[PDB]
Design an enzyme around this catalytic site. Structure first.
Site, mmCIF file in Angstrom:
data_model
loop_
_atom_site.group_PDB
_atom_site.id
_atom_site.type_symbol
_atom_site.label_atom_id
_atom_site.label_comp_id
_atom_site.label_asym_id
_atom_site.label_seq_id
_atom_site.Cartn_x
_atom_site.Cartn_y
_atom_site.Cartn_z
ATOM 1 N N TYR A 202 0.459 8.597 6.468
ATOM 2 C CA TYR A 202 1.659 8.299 7.235
ATOM 3 C C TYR A 202 2.061 9.478 8.103
ATOM 4 O O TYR A 202 2.309 9.299 9.300
ATOM 5 C CB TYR A 202 2.823 7.886 6.318
ATOM 6 C CG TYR A 202 3.897 7.138 7.077
ATOM 7 C CD1 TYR A 202 3.760 5.784 7.346
ATOM 8 C CD2 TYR A 202 5.035 7.783 7.538
ATOM 9 C CE1 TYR A 202 4.727 5.090 8.050
ATOM 10 C CE2 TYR A 202 6.011 7.094 8.243
ATOM 11 C CZ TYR A 202 5.851 5.749 8.495
ATOM 12 O OH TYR A 202 6.816 5.056 9.195
ATOM 13 N N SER B 148 1.443 2.422 11.548
ATOM 14 C CA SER B 148 2.677 2.538 12.323
ATOM 15 C C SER B 148 3.130 3.974 12.544
ATOM 16 O O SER B 148 3.937 4.246 13.438
ATOM 17 C CB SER B 148 3.798 1.767 11.626
ATOM 18 O OG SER B 148 5.077 2.220 12.047
ATOM 19 N N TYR B 149 2.627 4.894 11.740
ATOM 20 C CA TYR B 149 2.525 6.295 12.120
ATOM 21 C C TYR B 149 1.188 6.899 11.729
ATOM 22 O O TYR B 149 0.666 7.734 12.473
ATOM 23 C CB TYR B 149 3.661 7.124 11.500
ATOM 24 C CG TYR B 149 3.938 8.429 12.228
ATOM 25 C CD1 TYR B 149 3.044 9.488 12.171
ATOM 26 C CD2 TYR B 149 5.095 8.601 12.969
ATOM 27 C CE1 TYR B 149 3.288 10.676 12.832
ATOM 28 C CE2 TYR B 149 5.348 9.792 13.634
ATOM 29 C CZ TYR B 149 4.439 10.824 13.562
ATOM 30 O OH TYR B 149 4.680 12.010 14.218
ATOM 31 N N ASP C 237 5.117 -8.277 16.965
ATOM 32 C CA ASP C 237 5.650 -6.996 16.520
ATOM 33 C C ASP C 237 6.843 -6.620 17.389
ATOM 34 O O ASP C 237 6.686 -6.305 18.572
ATOM 35 C CB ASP C 237 4.573 -5.921 16.590
ATOM 36 C CG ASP C 237 4.907 -4.703 15.745
ATOM 37 O OD1 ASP C 237 6.017 -4.148 15.899
ATOM 38 O OD2 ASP C 237 4.043 -4.273 14.952
ATOM 39 N N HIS D 146 5.525 -6.726 12.410
ATOM 40 C CA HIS D 146 5.024 -5.369 12.222
ATOM 41 C C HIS D 146 4.394 -5.189 10.847
ATOM 42 O O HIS D 146 3.218 -4.825 10.730
ATOM 43 C CB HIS D 146 6.164 -4.377 12.429
ATOM 44 C CG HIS D 146 5.750 -2.951 12.296
ATOM 45 N ND1 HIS D 146 4.702 -2.413 13.013
ATOM 46 C CD2 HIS D 146 6.240 -1.949 11.529
ATOM 47 C CE1 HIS D 146 4.564 -1.143 12.691
ATOM 48 N NE2 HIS D 146 5.485 -0.835 11.795
#
Ligand SMILES: *[C@@H]1O[C@H](CO)[C@@H](O[C@@H]2O[C@H](CO)[C@@H](O[C@@H]3O[C@H](CO)[C@@H](O)[C@H](O)[C@@H]3O)[C@H](O)[C@H]2NC(C)=O)[C@H](O)[C@H]1NC(C)=O
Ligand SMILES: *[C@@H]1O[C@H](CO)[C@@H](O[C@@H]2O[C@H](CO)[C@@H](O[C@@H]3O[C@H](CO)[C@@H](O)[C@H](O)[C@@H]3O)[C@H](O)[C@H]2NC(C)=O)[C@H](O)[C@H]1NC(C)=O
Ligand SMILES: *[C@@H]1O[C@H](CO)[C@@H](O[C@@H]2O[C@H](CO)[C@@H](O)[C@H](O)[C@H]2NC(C)=O)[C@H](O)[C@H]1NC(C)=O
Ligand SMILES: *[C@@H]1O[C@H](CO)[C@@H](O[C@@H]2O[C@H](CO)[C@@H](O)[C@H](O)[C@H]2NC(C)=O)[C@H](O)[C@H]1NC(C)=O
Ligand SMILES: *[C@@H]1O[C@H](CO)[C@@H](O[C@@H]2O[C@H](CO)[C@@H](O)[C@H](O)[C@H]2NC(C)=O)[C@H](O)[C@H]1NC(C)=O
Ligand SMILES: *[C@@H]1O[C@H](CO)[C@@H](O[C@@H]2O[C@H](CO)[C@@H](O)[C@H](O)[C@H]2NC(C)=O)[C@H](O)[C@H]1NC(C)=O
Ligand SMILES: *[C@@H]1O[C@H](CO)[C@@H](O)[C@H](O)[C@H]1NC(C)=O
Ligand SMILES: *[C@@H]1O[C@H](CO)[C@@H](O)[C@H](O)[C@H]1NC(C)=O
Ligand SMILES: *[C@@H]1O[C@H](CO)[C@@H](O)[C@H](O)[C@H]1NC(C)=O
Lengths: 724, 208, 183
Positions: free
Chosen positions: A505, A588-589, A666, A698
């Site tokens: 992450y 998403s990161y 998303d 998402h």
């Protein structure tokens, strides 16, 4: 002996239980059992059936949720639940009168109601409908409309817009009752000039033409919504207009946020404001002057919080926890050494007084009484990835007493707590690193009253399965200690060399390495495919000091990327990791980091997966982005906004196997971001893989889609590692 | 043998002022078995506990049962002075008493509902002076005198009733007024237990 | 029909208005609480800008009247159409319930303007000598907490429950004491 196969992860064959309760007193809680709602009394151990499951299906239709009035006279039944976003929705609500034990038929609550909240005492109601606030002094009493400018995508009264719900409040609610229920504080948002994101929705095969969904979404630097705070007297609502509480002057120099509203007393309200450049936070204490009658916000009780190395708080400034008399509060602040600790504020005093210190942080404040304060910290054994319950004596700050450290030190190192009113009892929840556990305790002597859930069925079911092991260990990078975790295959042999897969992450104030017990996809790989799944908390991670956390400030995609590579280089030095079979993936990161890692030219990783990745900080919302990267103006930080794009790294993707996944619906990390990547990969002669998931949000979580993406990623990794 | 609760599960329950009574001697009871047929909302006992009432031995056990709305639960206290414990139903203080408010579940179909709950909210007597009122407050374990003129189900909230007393019966008038509460979806009932202890007759024990 | 004119703003109130065809309306003795009768039901408004709270819901023409007199009561007893009696503090409201369901009705024709081709028949509950008289019941309602405790009936004394009877007067002694004249 059987192994943790993939079907075991995707079919939820091996279910892990929990014990979720709602404290409705200082000694009573509600718990749902066999679809019945039982009322437990912790002062005597006796429990009655409070709500038969018979009266759950005999209405007309399936009921989704419930919320019992604080006076236990009425029950709200939620049905026709239609999902809006992460925390938002619209549904219809019924009121069940418990005094007559009969359903209410008159003065009902309209369909398509967005929000609803009981008063803290009694049976008053406040709901939001067509972006307007309505109040009901009693279920048998007509509604009183408070606001009348409710405009979709323009004006919202009492409910948050998208960015506030996602990035600030973490709830759709913008109503705040006063403890007596006399006052209501509601927020008004204005997204009139906020630009809109638009994406298509390809619904059921019947829909001939696709729908275009519009959502006010300010991107980095775009126009941000405004917020205003109004308070309303419920007892004399037809006397004055809603009284606006103007924000402090310190925050009125430009755009600003409203991040917390807490009630100190029955006539005192506290408002936490935040500037748009998120290194300046202020608390305003406002009393009700019954004369004019206004809300008197004395300047001498303004309380500022700043940051010199970056932003304020972890994700947003800490919320204050007021004392029983509302003349003081305790809030978490960074000390001189840069560690989040508990500070004591006096309402009228300009300075605060730290009551905890050390090379460890306080996670949060859980409960508060006149003699003790309860909180969670990662102090025990100096492990940042652990959580344990402590209490502080308010006379002798030196008398700190851990309440969870020695209960089961080998099985449980990650605790959380849910307290009752006045902290008379508290529910303990252990999350790992072995099988979770739930217990009921009394604060008078901190003795376990009863064991609520032991997951004994889980325990024996894993005995027959070759389960992987989780190691909490650390390493040193430029002399700084850095923690990581490894999911080790069963029958692990350090003489043999395994393939390595890194879970990322790397987000600001993130923590992927912790003593938590999960039945994840990584559990499958190690137990079945014999892959080592690792996760490393480098610079930019949290709970280890503002030094490590704020190192990434204004430089996103620089140090959290290198340190994932550098730690991966360390893992190769070990004698049990194949140099040629190291991979990486994120979400998403991580998908941002995973992508930015493969583009670094490190020659460390063979393949990668990016799921709903960020591709440029120009594309993500302003609240999260500007907090760490500032404004994309040539005068503030436009340089690194450009220097940190995944697209700038396309040529170095010729050396790895890239798999890019993204859902089309998303609303958080827009499909625009992944599309910009492929354009950079296509324009550079780089070959890769892709896979879209239509109408998936998402957090791709539909049963059909959840199983498909992981079954797709399993085939990818097995092809990259040359596995059966 | 076995205490027969059959009269309680069959037919239309009477109203509070016409309460039916089941007297139990020389039998074996299982309270929890009976209360398992209902949806028991409140269980309050005097001079005894709800745990003890279902597990102890008595010489004689009385069970008054009648229709009663859960909304008026506050009026079934023997200490209250409202138009239930004044004119309709009262428990004795000289023996352990228990009070059970139940709800007839959907799968208990042998209990028929009436049109509405009714109760006497005034029952007094007018003497031959035609000037003096004497309210007839009901005594424990006895019926109100006005049940001769108050019908089994009050037609409308406010209906009054009258009967002229013969000179031998005291002369004057017997006068009563009734009230109603609208019927619930599921019939809500009230049960009243009263136990008694005698010399050798301790013959009402829980079975095994 | 009644409009409400706010003197604090010097403006006409447009929301939560008072319905057309309102039969009765009375302010509270203190403050600004309204009580009106519409379709023979009693409605209360804690404030002009506040929604109406319906108190009674059995209002039927020529059978049930809440808060307004019937014919004989207006003509021969009350000398006023009103049967609403406020508490001096405005806390309580005493209203009367009339029932002319079995009261015989007189019928007379109305020969309106030359336009009317067929004459109207007008029916009016009118108890002649010895006929069934209307009943009356007295109920009191707490305005400040109207949601719970459905209206409380004040039963007539026993001296008058020997047969048919009238209700002549309702007067408030104190903020918690009420007097009823029966006949
Ligand atoms: C919600 O936000 C919108 C826009 O953010 C607000 O409307 C806008 O208000 C501004 C002024 O506050 C208007 O801009 C200009 O005002 C000057 C004043 O001298 C005038 O000369 C210009 O002609 C121009 O109007 C702007 O027009 C207006 N935009 C609209 C109405 O679309 C709105 O007031 C906010 N509403 C709430 C409830 O917060
Ligand atoms: C308004 O007045 C009318 C007539 O005075 C009331 O209706 C009538 O009520 C009586 C009893 O109060 C009913 O008479 C008989 O009742 C016996 C009871 O044993 C029954 O067996 C008979 O079959 C008969 O019903 C009468 O039917 C009924 N007439 C109707 C409803 O048209 C009415 O209740 C009064 N309402 C109020 C609000 O005061
Ligand atoms: C809840 O609290 C509020 C404020 O503390 C109360 O409002 C005041 O109550 C005091 C007495 O408690 C009065 O003297 C004031 O005139 C009231 N002022 C206002 C503006 O309300 C309120 O009465 C309390 N309500 C309950 C139900 O406890
Ligand atoms: C919060 O951050 C901003 C920018 O990140 C700081 O703004 C600086 O303000 C000083 C004035 O004292 C200017 O000389 C600098 O040029 C500004 N920097 C930038 C990048 O614009 C602001 O000082 C910070 N606030 C605190 C309390 O540290
Ligand atoms: C609760 O579950 C735990 C397992 O997490 C049980 O603890 C184990 O008990 C066995 C006994 O057969 C021991 O051999 C293990 O060493 C224990 N493991 C741990 C981690 O403590 C415990 O017995 C269960 N408790 C109850 C009341 O069922
Ligand atoms: C008007 O009078 C009524 C009754 O006299 C008041 O109601 C009571 O007020 C007392 C305090 O004076 C409280 O202790 C009681 O609990 C109240 N009872 C009820 C039933 O209301 C009422 O407050 C007065 N209101 C005004 C505006 O004068
Ligand atoms: C309802 O609760 C009862 C209580 O024991 C249980 O037996 C029954 O299975 C439950 N039914 C459902 C559908 O949950
Ligand atoms: C537990 O016992 C107390 C006293 O016996 C009683 O008041 C309480 O209602 C009981 N709990 C429940 C849930 O009924
Ligand atoms: C009494 O009834 C309960 C209700 O299920 C039952 O559990 C118990 O065994 C019964 N006792 C006897 C002696 O039959």
């Amino acid at each position: 002996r059987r192994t943790y196969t993939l079907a075991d992860y995707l079919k939820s064959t091996i279910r892990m239980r929990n014990y979720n309760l709602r404290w409705i007193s200082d000694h009573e809680y509600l718990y749902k059992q066999e679809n019945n709602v039982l009322l437990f009394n912790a002062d005597h151990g006796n429990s009655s059936t409070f709500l038969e499951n018979s009266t759950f299906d005999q209405f007309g239709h399936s009921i989704s949720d419930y919320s019992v009035s604080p006076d236990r006279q009425f029950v709200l039944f939620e049905y026709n639940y239609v999902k809006k976003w992460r925390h938002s929705y619209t549904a219809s609500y019924d009121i069940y009168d418990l005094n007559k034990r009969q359903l209410i038929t008159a003065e009902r609550i309209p369909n398509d109601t967005q929000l609803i909240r009981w008063s803290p005492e009694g049976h008053k109601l406040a709901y939001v409908w067509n972006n307007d606030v309505y109040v009901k002094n009693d279920p048998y009493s007509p509604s009183q409309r408070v606001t009348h400018d409710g405009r979709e995508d323009a004006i919202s009264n009492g409910i948050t817009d998208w960015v506030y719900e996602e990035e600030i409040f973490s709830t759709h609610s913008a109503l705040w009752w006063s403890p007596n229920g006399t006052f209501l504080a509601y927020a008004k948002f204005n997204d009139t000039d906020v630009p809109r994101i638009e994406y298509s929705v390809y619904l059921d095969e019947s829909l001939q033409y696709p729908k275009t969904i519009h959502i006010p979404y300010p991107k980095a630097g775009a126009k941000n919504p405004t917020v205003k705070l109004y308070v309303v007297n419920t007892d004399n609502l037809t006397d004055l207009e809603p009284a606006q509480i103007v924000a402090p002057a310190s925050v009125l120099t430009g755009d600003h946020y409203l991040c917390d509203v807490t009630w100190a007393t029955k006539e005192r309200i506290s408002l936490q404001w935040l500037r748009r450049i998120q290194n300046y936070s202020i608390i305003d204490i406002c009393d009700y002057n019954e004369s004019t009658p206004k809300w008197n916000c004395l300047v001498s009780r303004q309380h500022i919080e700043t940051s010199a190395t970056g932003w304020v708080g972890r994700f947003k400034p800490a919320e204050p926890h007021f004392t029983s008399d509302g003349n003081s509060f305790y809030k978490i602040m960074s000390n001189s050494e840069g560690y989040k600790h508990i500070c004591l504020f006096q309402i009228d005093k300009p300075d605060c007084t730290f009551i905890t210190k050390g090379a460890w942080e306080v996670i949060g404040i859980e409960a508060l009484t006149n003699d003790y304060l309860y909180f969670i910290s990662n102090e025990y054994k100096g492990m940042p990835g652990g959580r344990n319950l402590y209490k502080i004596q308010l006379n002798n700050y030196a008398n700190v007493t851990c309440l969870s450290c020695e209960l089961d030190p080998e099985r449980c190192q990650y605790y959380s707590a849910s307290f009752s009113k006045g902290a008379k009892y508290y529910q303990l929840r252990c999350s790992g690193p072995q099988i979770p556990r739930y217990s009921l305790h009394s604060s008078s002597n901190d003795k376990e009253l009863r064991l609520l859930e032991n997951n004994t069925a889980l325990y024996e079911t894993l005995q027959n399965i070759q389960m992987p092991r989780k190691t909490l260990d650390f390493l040193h990078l430029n002399g700084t200690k850095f923690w990581y975790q490894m999911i080790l295959p069963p029958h692990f042999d350090k003489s043999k060399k395994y393939p390595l897969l890194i879970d990322v992450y790397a987000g600001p104030c993130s923590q992927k390495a912790d003593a938590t017990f999960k039945l994840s996809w990584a559990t499958y790989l190690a137990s079945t495919e014999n892959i080592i799944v690792a996760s490393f908390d480098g610079r930019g991670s949290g709970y280890q000091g503002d030094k490590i956390m704020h190192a990434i400030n204004r430089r996103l995609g620089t140090f959290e990327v290198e340190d994932q590579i550098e730690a991966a280089k360390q893992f190769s030095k070990m004698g049990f990791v194949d140099d040629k079979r190291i991979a990486i993936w994120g979400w998403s990161y991580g998908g941002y980091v995973t992508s930015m890692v493969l583009g670094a030219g490190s020659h460390v990783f063979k393949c990668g997966i990016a799921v709903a990745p960020v591709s440029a900080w120009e594309f993500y919302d302003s609240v999260y982005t500007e907090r760490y990267m500032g404004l994309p103006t040539p005068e503030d930080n436009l340089d690194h906004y450009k220097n940190s794009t995944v697209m700038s790294r396309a040529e170095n993707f010729k050396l790895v196997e890239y798999l890019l996944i993204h859902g089309t619906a998303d609303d958080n990390v827009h499909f625009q971001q992944s599309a910009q990547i492929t354009r950079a990969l296509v324009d550079a002669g780089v070959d890769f893989q892709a896979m879209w998931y239509t109408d998936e949000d998402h957090g791709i979580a539909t049963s059909t889609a959840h199983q498909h993406i992981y079954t797709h990623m399993t085939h990818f990794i097995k092809q990259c590692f040359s596995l059966p | 043998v076995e205490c027969d609760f059959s009269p309680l599960l069959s037919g239309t329950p009477p109203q509070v002022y016409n309460f039916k009574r089941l007297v139990f001697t020389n039998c074996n009871y299982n309270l929890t078995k009976l209360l398992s047929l209902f949806s028991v909302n409140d269980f309050t006992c005097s001079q005894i506990s709800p745990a003890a009432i279902a597990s102890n031995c008595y010489s004689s056990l009385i069970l008054d049962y009648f229709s009663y709305p859960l909304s008026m639960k506050s009026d079934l206290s023997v200490s209250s002075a409202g138009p239930i414990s004044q004119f309709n139903y009262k428990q004795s203080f000289s023996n352990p008493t228990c009070l059970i408010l139940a709800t007839v579940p959907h799968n208990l179909t042998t209990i028929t509902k009436p049109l509405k709950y009714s109760y006497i909210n005034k029952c007094s007597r007018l003497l031959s002076d035609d000037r003096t009122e004497v309210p007839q407050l009901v005594n424990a374990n006895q019926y109100s005198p006005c049940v001769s003129i108050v019908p089994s189900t009050v037609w409308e909230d406010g209906d009054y009733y009258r009967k002229q007393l013969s000179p031998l019966e005291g002369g004057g008038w017997l006068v009563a007024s009734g009230s109603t509460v609208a019927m619930t979806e599921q019939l809500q009932m009230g049960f009243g237990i009263t136990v008694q202890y005698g010399t050798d007759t301790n013959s009402v024990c829980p079975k095994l």
